[PDB]
């Protein structure tokens, strides 16, 4: 966390920094999206 890394979440590839977020996801949701439909927040597997 807090470091510029290139991640891979269930085949969702990208580069950025991962930080703790306070976006109250609903149980059925998996990841959020921004205005331009790029993934903004994500729920990581095997940790929820």
């Amino acid at each position: 966390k807090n470091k510029c890394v290139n991640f891979n979440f269930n085949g969702l590839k990208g580069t950025g920094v991962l930080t703790e977020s306070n976006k109250k996801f609903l149980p059925f949701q998996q990841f959020g999206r921004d205005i331009a439909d790029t993934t903004d927040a994500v729920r990581d597997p095997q940790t929820l």
Binding site: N6, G14, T15, G16, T38
Partner: protein
Amino acid sequence: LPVSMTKTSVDCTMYICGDSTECSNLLLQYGSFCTQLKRALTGIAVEQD
């Protein structure tokens, strides 16, 4: 009377390819578009001042 408007700058490769490196490699094949956009925006920016 309006006098000046907002000076704006656009990162061509960041907007058009995001973080994908091979996208930038493909984008290099399209010539000097980003150069012309940067030049035009810089001209507008100095014109405002």
